[PDB]
Amino acid sequence: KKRWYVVQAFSGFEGRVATSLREHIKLHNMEDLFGEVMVPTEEVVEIRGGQRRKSERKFFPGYVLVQMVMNDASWHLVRSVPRVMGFIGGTSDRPAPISDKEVDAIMNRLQQ
Amino acid sequence: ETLRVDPTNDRLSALVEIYRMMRPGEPPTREAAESLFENLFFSEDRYDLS
Amino acid sequence: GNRRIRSVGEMAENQFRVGLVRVERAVKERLSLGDLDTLMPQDMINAKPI
DNA sequence: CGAGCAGCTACTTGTGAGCGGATA
DNA sequence: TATCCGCTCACAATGCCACACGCGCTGCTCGGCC
RNA sequence: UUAAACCGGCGUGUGGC
Numbered sequence: 348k349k350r351w352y353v354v355q356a357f358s359g360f361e362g363r364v365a366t367s368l369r370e371h372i373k374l375h376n377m378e379d380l381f382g383e384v385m386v387p388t389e390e391v392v393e394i395r396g397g398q399r400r401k402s403e404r405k406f407f408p409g410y411v412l413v414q415m416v417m418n419d420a421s422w423h424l425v426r427s428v429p430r431v432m433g434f435i436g437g438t439s440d441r442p443a444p445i446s447d448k449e450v451d452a453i454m455n456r457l458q459q
Numbered sequence: 460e461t462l463r464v465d466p467t468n469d470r471l472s473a474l475v476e477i478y479r480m481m482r483p484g485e486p487p488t489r490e491a492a493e494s495l496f497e498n499l500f501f502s503e504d505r506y507d508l509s
Numbered sequence: 510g511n512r513r514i515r516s517v518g519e520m521a522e523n524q525f526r527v528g529l530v531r532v533e534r535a536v537k538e539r540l541s542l543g544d545l546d547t548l549m550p551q552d553m554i555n556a557k558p559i
Numbered sequence: 560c561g562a563g564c565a566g567c568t569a570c571t572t573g574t575g576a577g578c579g580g581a582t583a
Numbered sequence: 584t585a586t587c588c589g590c591t592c593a594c595a596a597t598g599c600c601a602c603a604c605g606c607g608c609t610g611c612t613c614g615g616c617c
Numbered sequence: 618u619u620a621a622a623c624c625g626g627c628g629u630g631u632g633g634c
């Protein structure tokens with residue numbers, strides 16, 4: 348079962364970290380074990396009124412929790428790409444992901 | 460004595476223990492222990508004996 | 510006989526290699542997604558980090 | 560729009576105490 | 584199940600004075616209550 | 618309300634005792 352594991356990374360370039368993680372998936376055709384990135388930094392203000400239009404299209408913590416059924420080779424893959432500061436979770440280093448109710452919560456956050 | 464004090468005997472478990480000592484945890488399955496042990500001493504990029 | 514002296518040249522070369530590995534990582538991250546026949550090999554590299 | 564975060568070492572030595580630990 | 588043996592970490596390392604220098608760039612994301 | 622009066626933080630390097 349492709350669970351939704353949460354991971355923290357080198358912030359700032361978090362979107363580019365997600366794209367590099369995707370490139371590393373598609374390199375070793377890891378889409379069998381893996382899913383997508385779910386970076387729902389999608390608070391979508393567009394107040395493009397007078398005197399200012401630069402609206403903050405992005406708002407979400409720097410977590411890029413990825414759907415995947417975890418394997419130790421998969422863990423060392425997601426750690427092999429740079430900018431993976433913390434693969435968080437209660438464990439030595441092999442964690443348990445967030446439950447499905449928070450999957451519904453992140454669906455709400457995406458839709459909003 | 461250095462052999463009998465070593466809890467691991469095969470290269471497999473030896474790699475697991477040397478990885479646990481190198482990087483605390485990160486449990487591999489014959490994937491990252493060997494890679495790190497080969498990249499630590501035998502890689503020309505991370506070893507520059509002139 | 511067991512102590513070696515390094516002059517300005519060796520330390521400058523060490524710092525240059527420290528910058529070169531960083532710009533190598535940069536051009537590796539830039540080439541991982543770059544396509545063919547789009548640019549000249551000038552924007553792939555940067556001068557501010559070195 | 561402004562501000563904050565962030566990405567582009569290996570010889571110190573001693574002294575001491577607290578914490579496994581191992582060994583009957 | 585008690586008693587040394589060894590592992591691991593904290594804490595410390597004369598005092599003053601004088602001089603000088605350097606303490607970054609740009610992109611993203613988040614904070615919103617004058 | 619009015620007048621007068623006053624208003625070195627850090628690191629680094631070097632050197633000396």
